[PDB]
Ligand binder design. Sequence first.
Ligand SMILES: [Zn+2]
Ligand SMILES: [Zn+2]
Ligand SMILES: [Zn+2]
Length: 572
Amino acid sequence: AVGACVLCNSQTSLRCGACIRRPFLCCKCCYDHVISTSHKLVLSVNPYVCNAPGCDVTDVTQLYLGGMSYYCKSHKPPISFPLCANGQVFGLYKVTDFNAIATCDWTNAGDYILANTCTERLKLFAAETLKATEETFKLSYGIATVREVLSDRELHLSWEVGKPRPPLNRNYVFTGYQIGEYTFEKDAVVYRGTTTYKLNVGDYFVLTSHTVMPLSAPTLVPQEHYVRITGLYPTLNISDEFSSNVANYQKVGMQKYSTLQGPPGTGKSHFAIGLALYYPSARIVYTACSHAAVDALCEKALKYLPIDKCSRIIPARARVECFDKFKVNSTLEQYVFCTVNALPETTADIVVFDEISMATNYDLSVVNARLRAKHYVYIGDPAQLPAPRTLLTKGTLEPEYFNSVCRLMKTIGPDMFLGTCRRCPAEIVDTVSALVYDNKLKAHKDKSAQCFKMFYKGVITHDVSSAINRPQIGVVREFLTRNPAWRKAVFISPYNSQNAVASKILGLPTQTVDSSQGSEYDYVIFTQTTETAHSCNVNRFNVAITRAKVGILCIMSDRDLYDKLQFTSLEI
Ligand SMILES: [Zn+2]
Ligand SMILES: [Zn+2]
Ligand SMILES: [Zn+2]
């Protein structure tokens, strides 16, 4: 019951009882909160409730101190002082933004904007409040019971009436009942258990409701600039492969933290592994939110770093298959590759946090809490996709609001920028450079003359809210008959249901724009499917077309993005 005020640190016995996180609020701040919001329950050792028997007065503005006890206006003794007066609430040791975070439902973009523009202590309050709000929202969905199992990868389900049905995509990972986590894809549904089990008829599934721990560490530690490289010892014999990043690796040792904006295929992973070769004695912990992002760093390390000094940390509760070439769960290795949610409590000379656009302020704070480092490097791209905000339904979340690191990269600029894309044909590089990089992204490859665009709105159908465009898939099928080299293309769309229909009709491997992030393919066939804000999102658009090494076919719905594509137009 005794803590520090979550806005001005002034110690207090007061906590807000109406706040879902019950933050410690001081006398002067607690008052400013309760007088401005519907939040009136104040908590101490004992709550601020009318001590008189059978009285349900809990509002702190309607209460008084009757010597040492608390009473309402109807039960107070003559010698009683109001709890609320003179800009203070009676407490021991005797903000408009805090009120908005404390009371919002997290469905508006303006809520996330504030959660990033506010002070550092309010960013942590916003991050735990949001995550707890996101968790309690998991209880607000219906249960799915197994009616019949058709095969090892397909079954039928009975849904709970009254409670809404969750979207059947990769994003939502259910918990089977204790038969492990279970994913699904759209009455014939495709079941995918994270544990191979003979699905029982009668068994049911419920969403993974995890406990929101409190945040102690800031999203970003305070910046320190040094005159020399600190606690790190550079090589003189530096591989010419990594010579392009020498000045940036030196910048890394002369700052507490550094930001790196690496557009698609500009050398982010190469930069991260090369930092290990530049400071060969430094213990480095490689982290990211996803297992796929941690695995991509493991792949590059396997090629340049000694396999004996590496360890891939796998949480005992396995959710997907992982990188199996390093020693598993050896926390004391020089190189430790681990997802944020699985990080052990340890120290490092350098912490490298990759795919920074996918991180939330919650993850930024967890990393600062689980890892104590001499240097922190944040690598990613604010022009790529952020983490999904399941509660956000109104307004669009701009890149400067993804997290603290992205806010810095978009306002003051990144400390380091990888300006040459070595993956994409120049048609794609020139398009995304103008679209999201203010003409600063350069092409290393020449124009491939294999980048096509087709303006074809088609017909939009819906599998609930996930969209399908069968005519756009028809146009692709027609193109494939005339272009057999594209037989090896990966099909990409903004919708899982579009991808499910394309997988059956075209037989091409399928990927949503969001799941393709961090991956590359020689050929990519992209159908925009709709002209919604989701399918027209410039960050999603940038990720979609930058997956291609050689060629891309874009069947577009939006005139704007189609006209922006510096591709050869096709007819039919
Ligand atoms: Zn205060
Ligand atoms: Zn409150
Ligand atoms: Zn009373």
